[PDB]
């Protein structure tokens, strides 16, 4: 081979050594997990929770929209009703061994009950323990949507909210009333 | 509360206990994963291997192309029907002690691919030590799984020699992380609104 | 008989009306107040098509297809822009007083009103005023009553009275306070009161026995069986 | 007339040429929303029609796609020839900047077509896959064997009567397949593999210690020289098209994410554009700008991965660490916007899932300041190294003729000097409003030439990001169409019409009216296309995904023959493929 290209190659190797050495003189780019906590943006799609309304009741009306919108089919729930007439989940289970954390259930929730939260540490020793029941999903507050209350908009009468007491609702006029 | 390979109690002289603790310390502080790329979960694994995450700090960066030298098999990807005998053969080629981490929903259960050409989870044919949910799990989830595996390794009993003592492997029955973190997870009230950064 | 729908020739039966003739051909006309067993009364005004006097006609006229006979040589258009806008307006007028109830309503996923709201392409609300409400009655152990969801399509009264021969269900009130139910709380006396849950296109009459252990229609496993 | 309007394309000169050559009754023109002339050709005239298109004055030189379709359950086939099955051939004329689909009808019993391998050599794998997934025989094919499923597979998975879900796992089948893998090297016959004839035989895979997947290559060797090589693919077959027949239009977006997993929103883009063609949705300009932003960010991510993987395959180990730090910066921005890292599933039918979060421009500005010095450092540290140039230059070269005849698109085709980028030739998603150049090669596609073209593409994507940051429109992030899935969330949460539309769209699915649409985009690795058939239902009747890695892997034996095995490793590292893209 040519001597000129040999000298060019030697100079290029020396230059590469020089850049790697100067990059050794640089600053570390490592975020030291777990001593340094990982920053997650507020809409990060991690662990799924069920949230509560500002009045403290659970937001889920067991409408099963998240379960059907799930492409993996890893949400199972059953509707139950209290004595006042509000709907709630009798049970709610998410199989997190199947869940792909796609956020379609949060997108499909009309009450903002189901939410994907910035939490990624969900490793488990047993796969059966990745099936999260309702006691593992229901949190103490409203999560990412602080003020929305579906039952303040719905037309059904529940405790503390009779007919005509929802948003943009008039009082019910009886057909027996004297006014035309 | 252990598992012998049957639910038995803790078998652990006091010098043998110290030797077992030293062996477990050396095993958990030096874990050599096998370089096996199935799907996108492997991309997040090797992302954890790089400079911005530095999985080398836990002593787990020596990524082996030979299953003989590897201690940890990270099934990180879909367990396809054509790839499942390859996975089983590579697991069989490993040496005791060997540990398995399912990374991602595909390796956990099949994930979104409940389809004709996918085996629904790698626990169908190999025993798994640590499962990671996610599609993909982020690199620090793989690091957290490594610490979970280290904590599981540090409380297991294995024979010091193949000629002296009980040769059974006693794996501890750990408390589930769901039950452990249920105290701090339910107490969460308010999160940051998604419209911010 | 011969009809021309959107410029396409069709051979139908002349004794039928236009809505049932077009539904028998696979054409999609939204409708509420018509039923194949109850006949046509032309209340809901949802089935509007544009009829022309002949082939060389451009103006036309909106007619109710449920009340228009499918006579020979009848020229109509379903996909006419004026007819589409009127059907969307009818769905919108029905939607002005409708409760925000679909997640907590037993007719969700099985709702004719949902299907026709989507079918008309109406998804933007420009009504900002209040919506009327109604008290509910107790109809017995079988039928649950939710009067807010009513669209005043009169199917229940026509079925229960003119078809089933029942006496205790009726329509009361006036202009936009029309009420459909019994004069007082009590069990529906007819032995065929349960068909109201399929006759009603909304969630007013619902299966209470199903509403105990409720699940949506897509979640059911069905089989063809004999009672 | 919008871009999604149903056209018959009878004004295309190819229709007039076909009428003047074969007569007016020799074929049937189908009106679609695919944007191409769709022509049903009789089976006995298929070879002469293909030859006539190959011998045009501005000929159709590339077979873009070739696949089957099971039409037995299709109810809305008005104006279509009677067909239990059909085979479509998508051909591209680069000089005309046009493309044509030819469809051959097939009866249920007579499932055989003449082979297309004589006219187009890249038809081999497409016909193998069509036989594998549909049972359609191709007469005259050299080795018509299964390519996705194993050879001991019963049935054809893409047929309508084939059960989509996973069968019950059995240890017996796993043990039998392990024994088959063990005795495969003992009872290897180089006749069923399409090979012929001191000739060593070696297996590279199936497991591979690299980031592009794990696949097996059977190598025939004369010493170090490669005499013949066939790839064993299908090891990463996820059944994505069959899942297209099983999900709704909205819930299939996460599956489109995982076609090639370095692309993300780049993979979401052709699917949502094709669904918007089916829905008649013209998205607003801010939607186009946001989707272009995310596509270019993920293009930079994928190109950084590709350059790092190539450099590590050559032998330098540090730039992969640095470019993974750069990928972390990109992932920070993408996590802020979409909420996820590599499978965002953020594109919606009619727009995107959310608006841009307040503060995204700071992260974009930080990345735009971070990137160019790092890219220059990568160039001066590894890409200008003479050892890397010696390992890369002159390795697996081909001209424009080989790139055209094998369907090679992306950086290889442009490294052969052919200036054919989808973002310029057939613009989509408002790419005409951005000023960016298309780098081209001198006429020879080396490994080094492909890598430097990808570097220049990275720089052009940085330029696109700069123009998008300086000029960001204000407006809606979703279209105002009734078929925008899902509707905007606040209107869903306080309006009953929007709640009804949301309820029916997320549960039963949006109803796409019966039509056929097609979208082709310039992905990170080549041309990625979605061909969508709707039978009027809430699910896709057919979801055909054309990926470029399939074509590049089929081009592999025609370019590496006569070379060494280290050259094969370098060629694998410089192709920019992932095995999920190959098998899908
Ligand atoms: C002592 C005197 C020996 C006889 C004279 C030697 C002249 C210099 C060496 C020579 O002939 O160099 C030309 C020869 C070309 O070899 P070629 O087949 O072209 O392949 C190498 C590609 N550059 O390249 C070579 O032979 C390679 C270099 C060999 C150098 C041997 C030592 C030469 C004297 C110092
Ligand atoms: C022994 C001396 C060998 C010759 C040294 C000077 C020439 C040289 O370094 O050539 C290699 C390379 C040439 O540059 P090139 O690759 O063309 O990149 C464009 C930028 N000029 O230039 C470089 O790589 C830049 C200069 C590197 C110098 C390294 C130290 C050389 C002396 C020891
Ligand atoms: C028998 C030959 C042994 C060669 C040395 C093997 C052990 C060192 C591996 C170094 C390494 C390589 C190459 C490497 O590519 C890599 O990235 C995935 C690492 O993790 C950060 C590594 O640690
Ligand atoms: S994030 Fe996606 S996969 Fe997970 S439960 Fe929700 S819809 Fe299902
Ligand atoms: S979509 Fe929301 S309200 Fe409906 S069942 Fe799911 S979590 Fe509950
Ligand atoms: S779990 Fe998701 S990210 Fe991981 S291999 Fe499967 S599709 Fe890829
Ligand atoms: S009757 Fe229909 S439109 Fe009305 S709340 Fe129930 S599901 Fe919704
Ligand atoms: S209660 Fe039902 S059937 Fe009766 S008028 Fe109202 S919507 Fe029609
Ligand atoms: S269906 Fe004709 S007006 Fe009601």
mmCIF file with all atom_site columns, N, CA, C and O in Angstrom, chain B residues 34 38 42 44 47 51 78 80 82-83 92 112-117 135 138 195-197, chain D residues 164-166 178 207 210 233 235-238 255 258 321 324 335 340-341 357-359:
data_model
loop_
_atom_site.group_PDB
_atom_site.id
_atom_site.type_symbol
_atom_site.label_atom_id
_atom_site.label_alt_id
_atom_site.label_comp_id
_atom_site.label_asym_id
_atom_site.label_entity_id
_atom_site.label_seq_id
_atom_site.pdbx_PDB_ins_code
_atom_site.Cartn_x
_atom_site.Cartn_y
_atom_site.Cartn_z
_atom_site.occupancy
_atom_site.B_iso_or_equiv
_atom_site.pdbx_formal_charge
_atom_site.auth_seq_id
_atom_site.auth_comp_id
_atom_site.auth_asym_id
_atom_site.auth_atom_id
_atom_site.pdbx_PDB_model_num
ATOM 1   N N  . UNK B 1 34  ? -26.536 -12.445 29.436 1.00 0.00 ? 34  UNK B N  1
ATOM 2   C CA . UNK B 1 34  ? -26.294 -13.017 28.123 1.00 0.00 ? 34  UNK B CA 1
ATOM 3   C C  . UNK B 1 34  ? -26.794 -12.065 27.045 1.00 0.00 ? 34  UNK B C  1
ATOM 4   O O  . UNK B 1 34  ? -27.888 -11.504 27.154 1.00 0.00 ? 34  UNK B O  1
ATOM 5   N N  . UNK B 1 38  ? -34.005 -10.159 21.031 1.00 0.00 ? 38  UNK B N  1
ATOM 6   C CA . UNK B 1 38  ? -35.251 -10.620 20.433 1.00 0.00 ? 38  UNK B CA 1
ATOM 7   C C  . UNK B 1 38  ? -36.030 -9.499  19.757 1.00 0.00 ? 38  UNK B C  1
ATOM 8   O O  . UNK B 1 38  ? -36.362 -9.604  18.575 1.00 0.00 ? 38  UNK B O  1
ATOM 9   N N  . UNK B 1 42  ? -34.895 -5.503  23.968 1.00 0.00 ? 42  UNK B N  1
ATOM 10  C CA . UNK B 1 42  ? -33.441 -5.592  23.942 1.00 0.00 ? 42  UNK B CA 1
ATOM 11  C C  . UNK B 1 42  ? -32.800 -4.241  23.653 1.00 0.00 ? 42  UNK B C  1
ATOM 12  O O  . UNK B 1 42  ? -31.710 -3.954  24.162 1.00 0.00 ? 42  UNK B O  1
ATOM 13  N N  . UNK B 1 44  ? -34.012 -1.349  24.639 1.00 0.00 ? 44  UNK B N  1
ATOM 14  C CA . UNK B 1 44  ? -33.976 -0.622  25.911 1.00 0.00 ? 44  UNK B CA 1
ATOM 15  C C  . UNK B 1 44  ? -32.980 -1.226  26.906 1.00 0.00 ? 44  UNK B C  1
ATOM 16  O O  . UNK B 1 44  ? -32.392 -0.492  27.713 1.00 0.00 ? 44  UNK B O  1
ATOM 17  N N  . UNK B 1 47  ? -29.734 0.096   25.873 1.00 0.00 ? 47  UNK B N  1
ATOM 18  C CA . UNK B 1 47  ? -29.726 1.509   26.228 1.00 0.00 ? 47  UNK B CA 1
ATOM 19  C C  . UNK B 1 47  ? -29.320 1.673   27.689 1.00 0.00 ? 47  UNK B C  1
ATOM 20  O O  . UNK B 1 47  ? -28.514 2.550   28.024 1.00 0.00 ? 47  UNK B O  1
ATOM 21  N N  . UNK B 1 51  ? -23.864 4.881   28.332 1.00 0.00 ? 51  UNK B N  1
ATOM 22  C CA . UNK B 1 51  ? -23.231 5.831   29.241 1.00 0.00 ? 51  UNK B CA 1
ATOM 23  C C  . UNK B 1 51  ? -24.230 6.645   30.048 1.00 0.00 ? 51  UNK B C  1
ATOM 24  O O  . UNK B 1 51  ? -23.923 7.042   31.176 1.00 0.00 ? 51  UNK B O  1
ATOM 25  N N  . UNK B 1 78  ? -40.310 -10.627 22.222 1.00 0.00 ? 78  UNK B N  1
ATOM 26  C CA . UNK B 1 78  ? -41.365 -11.598 21.986 1.00 0.00 ? 78  UNK B CA 1
ATOM 27  C C  . UNK B 1 78  ? -40.786 -12.996 21.837 1.00 0.00 ? 78  UNK B C  1
ATOM 28  O O  . UNK B 1 78  ? -39.735 -13.191 21.223 1.00 0.00 ? 78  UNK B O  1
ATOM 29  N N  . UNK B 1 80  ? -41.264 -15.801 19.990 1.00 0.00 ? 80  UNK B N  1
ATOM 30  C CA . UNK B 1 80  ? -41.851 -16.341 18.780 1.00 0.00 ? 80  UNK B CA 1
ATOM 31  C C  . UNK B 1 80  ? -41.748 -17.863 18.779 1.00 0.00 ? 80  UNK B C  1
ATOM 32  O O  . UNK B 1 80  ? -40.912 -18.454 19.466 1.00 0.00 ? 80  UNK B O  1
ATOM 33  N N  . UNK B 1 82  ? -40.827 -19.855 16.353 1.00 0.00 ? 82  UNK B N  1
ATOM 34  C CA . UNK B 1 82  ? -39.566 -20.314 15.785 1.00 0.00 ? 82  UNK B CA 1
ATOM 35  C C  . UNK B 1 82  ? -38.384 -20.019 16.697 1.00 0.00 ? 82  UNK B C  1
ATOM 36  O O  . UNK B 1 82  ? -37.380 -20.738 16.652 1.00 0.00 ? 82  UNK B O  1
ATOM 37  N N  . UNK B 1 83  ? -38.477 -18.979 17.526 1.00 0.00 ? 83  UNK B N  1
ATOM 38  C CA . UNK B 1 83  ? -37.385 -18.610 18.418 1.00 0.00 ? 83  UNK B CA 1
ATOM 39  C C  . UNK B 1 83  ? -37.439 -19.312 19.766 1.00 0.00 ? 83  UNK B C  1
ATOM 40  O O  . UNK B 1 83  ? -36.437 -19.300 20.487 1.00 0.00 ? 83  UNK B O  1
ATOM 41  N N  . UNK B 1 92  ? -30.667 -23.912 28.365 1.00 0.00 ? 92  UNK B N  1
ATOM 42  C CA . UNK B 1 92  ? -30.100 -25.194 28.768 1.00 0.00 ? 92  UNK B CA 1
ATOM 43  C C  . UNK B 1 92  ? -28.581 -25.178 28.726 1.00 0.00 ? 92  UNK B C  1
ATOM 44  O O  . UNK B 1 92  ? -27.934 -25.884 29.508 1.00 0.00 ? 92  UNK B O  1
ATOM 45  N N  . UNK B 1 112 ? -49.384 -7.743  23.802 1.00 0.00 ? 112 UNK B N  1
ATOM 46  C CA . UNK B 1 112 ? -50.395 -7.474  22.791 1.00 0.00 ? 112 UNK B CA 1
ATOM 47  C C  . UNK B 1 112 ? -50.431 -8.529  21.695 1.00 0.00 ? 112 UNK B C  1
ATOM 48  O O  . UNK B 1 112 ? -51.375 -8.537  20.902 1.00 0.00 ? 112 UNK B O  1
ATOM 49  N N  . UNK B 1 113 ? -49.435 -9.405  21.624 1.00 0.00 ? 113 UNK B N  1
ATOM 50  C CA . UNK B 1 113 ? -49.352 -10.383 20.543 1.00 0.00 ? 113 UNK B CA 1
ATOM 51  C C  . UNK B 1 113 ? -49.881 -11.736 21.010 1.00 0.00 ? 113 UNK B C  1
ATOM 52  O O  . UNK B 1 113 ? -49.158 -12.715 21.164 1.00 0.00 ? 113 UNK B O  1
ATOM 53  N N  . UNK B 1 114 ? -51.193 -11.765 21.238 1.00 0.00 ? 114 UNK B N  1
ATOM 54  C CA . UNK B 1 114 ? -51.935 -13.014 21.392 1.00 0.00 ? 114 UNK B CA 1
ATOM 55  C C  . UNK B 1 114 ? -52.304 -13.477 19.986 1.00 0.00 ? 114 UNK B C  1
ATOM 56  O O  . UNK B 1 114 ? -53.431 -13.327 19.515 1.00 0.00 ? 114 UNK B O  1
ATOM 57  N N  . UNK B 1 115 ? -51.310 -14.041 19.306 1.00 0.00 ? 115 UNK B N  1
ATOM 58  C CA . UNK B 1 115 ? -51.384 -14.359 17.887 1.00 0.00 ? 115 UNK B CA 1
ATOM 59  C C  . UNK B 1 115 ? -50.821 -15.762 17.687 1.00 0.00 ? 115 UNK B C  1
ATOM 60  O O  . UNK B 1 115 ? -50.172 -16.324 18.570 1.00 0.00 ? 115 UNK B O  1
ATOM 61  N N  . UNK B 1 116 ? -51.074 -16.317 16.498 1.00 0.00 ? 116 UNK B N  1
ATOM 62  C CA . UNK B 1 116 ? -50.778 -17.717 16.199 1.00 0.00 ? 116 UNK B CA 1
ATOM 63  C C  . UNK B 1 116 ? -49.293 -18.052 16.315 1.00 0.00 ? 116 UNK B C  1
ATOM 64  O O  . UNK B 1 116 ? -48.943 -19.204 16.589 1.00 0.00 ? 116 UNK B O  1
ATOM 65  N N  . UNK B 1 117 ? -48.409 -17.074 16.119 1.00 0.00 ? 117 UNK B N  1
ATOM 66  C CA . UNK B 1 117 ? -46.978 -17.331 16.000 1.00 0.00 ? 117 UNK B CA 1
ATOM 67  C C  . UNK B 1 117 ? -46.183 -16.853 17.210 1.00 0.00 ? 117 UNK B C  1
ATOM 68  O O  . UNK B 1 117 ? -44.967 -16.673 17.109 1.00 0.00 ? 117 UNK B O  1
ATOM 69  N N  . UNK B 1 135 ? -43.774 -1.903  27.888 1.00 0.00 ? 135 UNK B N  1
ATOM 70  C CA . UNK B 1 135 ? -43.703 -2.223  26.462 1.00 0.00 ? 135 UNK B CA 1
ATOM 71  C C  . UNK B 1 135 ? -43.174 -1.021  25.697 1.00 0.00 ? 135 UNK B C  1
ATOM 72  O O  . UNK B 1 135 ? -43.927 -0.289  25.050 1.00 0.00 ? 135 UNK B O  1
ATOM 73  N N  . UNK B 1 138 ? -38.608 1.030   30.583 1.00 0.00 ? 138 UNK B N  1
ATOM 74  C CA . UNK B 1 138 ? -37.527 1.977   30.437 1.00 0.00 ? 138 UNK B CA 1
ATOM 75  C C  . UNK B 1 138 ? -36.258 1.386   31.057 1.00 0.00 ? 138 UNK B C  1
ATOM 76  O O  . UNK B 1 138 ? -36.331 0.404   31.797 1.00 0.00 ? 138 UNK B O  1
ATOM 77  N N  . UNK B 1 195 ? -50.686 18.996  31.076 1.00 0.00 ? 195 UNK B N  1
ATOM 78  C CA . UNK B 1 195 ? -50.456 20.102  30.156 1.00 0.00 ? 195 UNK B CA 1
ATOM 79  C C  . UNK B 1 195 ? -49.110 20.782  30.359 1.00 0.00 ? 195 UNK B C  1
ATOM 80  O O  . UNK B 1 195 ? -48.708 21.585  29.511 1.00 0.00 ? 195 UNK B O  1
ATOM 81  N N  . UNK B 1 196 ? -48.413 20.489  31.450 1.00 0.00 ? 196 UNK B N  1
ATOM 82  C CA . UNK B 1 196 ? -47.107 21.068  31.715 1.00 0.00 ? 196 UNK B CA 1
ATOM 83  C C  . UNK B 1 196 ? -46.016 20.140  31.192 1.00 0.00 ? 196 UNK B C  1
ATOM 84  O O  . UNK B 1 196 ? -46.283 19.123  30.547 1.00 0.00 ? 196 UNK B O  1
ATOM 85  N N  . UNK B 1 197 ? -44.766 20.484  31.474 1.00 0.00 ? 197 UNK B N  1
ATOM 86  C CA . UNK B 1 197 ? -43.632 19.686  31.035 1.00 0.00 ? 197 UNK B CA 1
ATOM 87  C C  . UNK B 1 197 ? -42.771 19.284  32.224 1.00 0.00 ? 197 UNK B C  1
ATOM 88  O O  . UNK B 1 197 ? -42.971 19.764  33.339 1.00 0.00 ? 197 UNK B O  1
ATOM 89  N N  . UNK D 2 164 ? -56.964 -16.574 14.547 1.00 0.00 ? 164 UNK D N  1
ATOM 90  C CA . UNK D 2 164 ? -55.883 -15.623 14.771 1.00 0.00 ? 164 UNK D CA 1
ATOM 91  C C  . UNK D 2 164 ? -55.168 -15.837 16.099 1.00 0.00 ? 164 UNK D C  1
ATOM 92  O O  . UNK D 2 164 ? -53.959 -15.608 16.182 1.00 0.00 ? 164 UNK D O  1
ATOM 93  N N  . UNK D 2 165 ? -55.879 -16.275 17.133 1.00 0.00 ? 165 UNK D N  1
ATOM 94  C CA . UNK D 2 165 ? -55.327 -16.290 18.478 1.00 0.00 ? 165 UNK D CA 1
ATOM 95  C C  . UNK D 2 165 ? -54.290 -17.400 18.638 1.00 0.00 ? 165 UNK D C  1
ATOM 96  O O  . UNK D 2 165 ? -54.172 -18.310 17.814 1.00 0.00 ? 165 UNK D O  1
ATOM 97  N N  . UNK D 2 166 ? -53.519 -17.297 19.717 1.00 0.00 ? 166 UNK D N  1
ATOM 98  C CA . UNK D 2 166 ? -52.461 -18.257 19.986 1.00 0.00 ? 166 UNK D CA 1
ATOM 99  C C  . UNK D 2 166 ? -53.039 -19.616 20.349 1.00 0.00 ? 166 UNK D C  1
ATOM 100 O O  . UNK D 2 166 ? -53.994 -19.718 21.123 1.00 0.00 ? 166 UNK D O  1
ATOM 101 N N  . UNK D 2 178 ? -36.962 -28.593 19.096 1.00 0.00 ? 178 UNK D N  1
ATOM 102 C CA . UNK D 2 178 ? -35.583 -28.618 19.579 1.00 0.00 ? 178 UNK D CA 1
ATOM 103 C C  . UNK D 2 178 ? -34.798 -29.763 18.953 1.00 0.00 ? 178 UNK D C  1
ATOM 104 O O  . UNK D 2 178 ? -33.634 -29.591 18.568 1.00 0.00 ? 178 UNK D O  1
ATOM 105 N N  . UNK D 2 207 ? -29.418 -17.076 16.677 1.00 0.00 ? 207 UNK D N  1
ATOM 106 C CA . UNK D 2 207 ? -29.128 -15.982 17.593 1.00 0.00 ? 207 UNK D CA 1
ATOM 107 C C  . UNK D 2 207 ? -27.967 -15.147 17.065 1.00 0.00 ? 207 UNK D C  1
ATOM 108 O O  . UNK D 2 207 ? -26.979 -15.677 16.547 1.00 0.00 ? 207 UNK D O  1
ATOM 109 N N  . UNK D 2 210 ? -26.322 -8.702  18.190 1.00 0.00 ? 210 UNK D N  1
ATOM 110 C CA . UNK D 2 210 ? -26.416 -7.366  17.616 1.00 0.00 ? 210 UNK D CA 1
ATOM 111 C C  . UNK D 2 210 ? -27.796 -6.796  17.915 1.00 0.00 ? 210 UNK D C  1
ATOM 112 O O  . UNK D 2 210 ? -28.654 -7.466  18.498 1.00 0.00 ? 210 UNK D O  1
ATOM 113 N N  . UNK D 2 233 ? -35.579 -16.361 7.391  1.00 0.00 ? 233 UNK D N  1
ATOM 114 C CA . UNK D 2 233 ? -36.265 -15.267 8.064  1.00 0.00 ? 233 UNK D CA 1
ATOM 115 C C  . UNK D 2 233 ? -37.602 -15.778 8.576  1.00 0.00 ? 233 UNK D C  1
ATOM 116 O O  . UNK D 2 233 ? -37.913 -16.967 8.451  1.00 0.00 ? 233 UNK D O  1
ATOM 117 N N  . UNK D 2 235 ? -38.254 -15.534 11.833 1.00 0.00 ? 235 UNK D N  1
ATOM 118 C CA . UNK D 2 235 ? -38.051 -15.817 13.245 1.00 0.00 ? 235 UNK D CA 1
ATOM 119 C C  . UNK D 2 235 ? -38.691 -14.771 14.141 1.00 0.00 ? 235 UNK D C  1
ATOM 120 O O  . UNK D 2 235 ? -38.902 -15.042 15.323 1.00 0.00 ? 235 UNK D O  1
ATOM 121 N N  . UNK D 2 236 ? -39.009 -13.595 13.613 1.00 0.00 ? 236 UNK D N  1
ATOM 122 C CA . UNK D 2 236 ? -39.592 -12.509 14.385 1.00 0.00 ? 236 UNK D CA 1
ATOM 123 C C  . UNK D 2 236 ? -40.960 -12.128 13.840 1.00 0.00 ? 236 UNK D C  1
ATOM 124 O O  . UNK D 2 236 ? -41.313 -10.952 13.759 1.00 0.00 ? 236 UNK D O  1
ATOM 125 N N  . UNK D 2 237 ? -41.752 -13.127 13.465 1.00 0.00 ? 237 UNK D N  1
ATOM 126 C CA . UNK D 2 237 ? -43.060 -12.900 12.865 1.00 0.00 ? 237 UNK D CA 1
ATOM 127 C C  . UNK D 2 237 ? -44.104 -12.754 13.965 1.00 0.00 ? 237 UNK D C  1
ATOM 128 O O  . UNK D 2 237 ? -44.374 -13.705 14.703 1.00 0.00 ? 237 UNK D O  1
ATOM 129 N N  . UNK D 2 238 ? -44.688 -11.563 14.071 1.00 0.00 ? 238 UNK D N  1
ATOM 130 C CA . UNK D 2 238 ? -45.655 -11.250 15.114 1.00 0.00 ? 238 UNK D CA 1
ATOM 131 C C  . UNK D 2 238 ? -47.097 -11.291 14.633 1.00 0.00 ? 238 UNK D C  1
ATOM 132 O O  . UNK D 2 238 ? -48.001 -11.065 15.439 1.00 0.00 ? 238 UNK D O  1
ATOM 133 N N  . UNK D 2 255 ? -50.061 -1.259  17.549 1.00 0.00 ? 255 UNK D N  1
ATOM 134 C CA . UNK D 2 255 ? -49.447 -2.317  16.758 1.00 0.00 ? 255 UNK D CA 1
ATOM 135 C C  . UNK D 2 255 ? -48.636 -1.744  15.607 1.00 0.00 ? 255 UNK D C  1
ATOM 136 O O  . UNK D 2 255 ? -47.597 -2.302  15.240 1.00 0.00 ? 255 UNK D O  1
ATOM 137 N N  . UNK D 2 258 ? -44.994 -0.946  16.545 1.00 0.00 ? 258 UNK D N  1
ATOM 138 C CA . UNK D 2 258 ? -43.993 -1.990  16.696 1.00 0.00 ? 258 UNK D CA 1
ATOM 139 C C  . UNK D 2 258 ? -43.678 -2.719  15.398 1.00 0.00 ? 258 UNK D C  1
ATOM 140 O O  . UNK D 2 258 ? -43.203 -3.858  15.444 1.00 0.00 ? 258 UNK D O  1
ATOM 141 N N  . UNK D 2 321 ? -21.961 4.889   22.818 1.00 0.00 ? 321 UNK D N  1
ATOM 142 C CA . UNK D 2 321 ? -22.289 5.487   24.111 1.00 0.00 ? 321 UNK D CA 1
ATOM 143 C C  . UNK D 2 321 ? -22.679 6.951   23.958 1.00 0.00 ? 321 UNK D C  1
ATOM 144 O O  . UNK D 2 321 ? -23.693 7.403   24.521 1.00 0.00 ? 321 UNK D O  1
ATOM 145 N N  . UNK D 2 324 ? -26.018 7.302   22.209 1.00 0.00 ? 324 UNK D N  1
ATOM 146 C CA . UNK D 2 324 ? -27.118 6.917   23.079 1.00 0.00 ? 324 UNK D CA 1
ATOM 147 C C  . UNK D 2 324 ? -27.424 8.009   24.095 1.00 0.00 ? 324 UNK D C  1
ATOM 148 O O  . UNK D 2 324 ? -28.577 8.157   24.512 1.00 0.00 ? 324 UNK D O  1
ATOM 149 N N  . UNK D 2 335 ? -40.686 11.952  25.444 1.00 0.00 ? 335 UNK D N  1
ATOM 150 C CA . UNK D 2 335 ? -41.400 11.634  26.673 1.00 0.00 ? 335 UNK D CA 1
ATOM 151 C C  . UNK D 2 335 ? -42.231 12.811  27.146 1.00 0.00 ? 335 UNK D C  1
ATOM 152 O O  . UNK D 2 335 ? -43.350 12.629  27.638 1.00 0.00 ? 335 UNK D O  1
ATOM 153 N N  . UNK D 2 340 ? -44.280 8.676   26.176 1.00 0.00 ? 340 UNK D N  1
ATOM 154 C CA . UNK D 2 340 ? -43.592 7.402   26.057 1.00 0.00 ? 340 UNK D CA 1
ATOM 155 C C  . UNK D 2 340 ? -42.271 7.608   25.332 1.00 0.00 ? 340 UNK D C  1
ATOM 156 O O  . UNK D 2 340 ? -41.984 8.689   24.815 1.00 0.00 ? 340 UNK D O  1
ATOM 157 N N  . UNK D 2 341 ? -41.455 6.556   25.305 1.00 0.00 ? 341 UNK D N  1
ATOM 158 C CA . UNK D 2 341 ? -40.131 6.686   24.711 1.00 0.00 ? 341 UNK D CA 1
ATOM 159 C C  . UNK D 2 341 ? -40.083 6.241   23.254 1.00 0.00 ? 341 UNK D C  1
ATOM 160 O O  . UNK D 2 341 ? -39.885 7.068   22.362 1.00 0.00 ? 341 UNK D O  1
ATOM 161 N N  . UNK D 2 357 ? -47.311 19.950  25.123 1.00 0.00 ? 357 UNK D N  1
ATOM 162 C CA . UNK D 2 357 ? -47.251 20.493  26.481 1.00 0.00 ? 357 UNK D CA 1
ATOM 163 C C  . UNK D 2 357 ? -46.495 21.808  26.516 1.00 0.00 ? 357 UNK D C  1
ATOM 164 O O  . UNK D 2 357 ? -45.599 22.054  25.709 1.00 0.00 ? 357 UNK D O  1
ATOM 165 N N  . UNK D 2 358 ? -46.871 22.656  27.466 1.00 0.00 ? 358 UNK D N  1
ATOM 166 C CA . UNK D 2 358 ? -46.259 23.973  27.585 1.00 0.00 ? 358 UNK D CA 1
ATOM 167 C C  . UNK D 2 358 ? -44.817 23.840  28.057 1.00 0.00 ? 358 UNK D C  1
ATOM 168 O O  . UNK D 2 358 ? -44.559 23.360  29.165 1.00 0.00 ? 358 UNK D O  1
ATOM 169 N N  . UNK D 2 359 ? -43.878 24.262  27.214 1.00 0.00 ? 359 UNK D N  1
ATOM 170 C CA . UNK D 2 359 ? -42.459 24.148  27.502 1.00 0.00 ? 359 UNK D CA 1
ATOM 171 C C  . UNK D 2 359 ? -41.691 23.221  26.583 1.00 0.00 ? 359 UNK D C  1
ATOM 172 O O  . UNK D 2 359 ? -40.487 23.028  26.803 1.00 0.00 ? 359 UNK D O  1
#
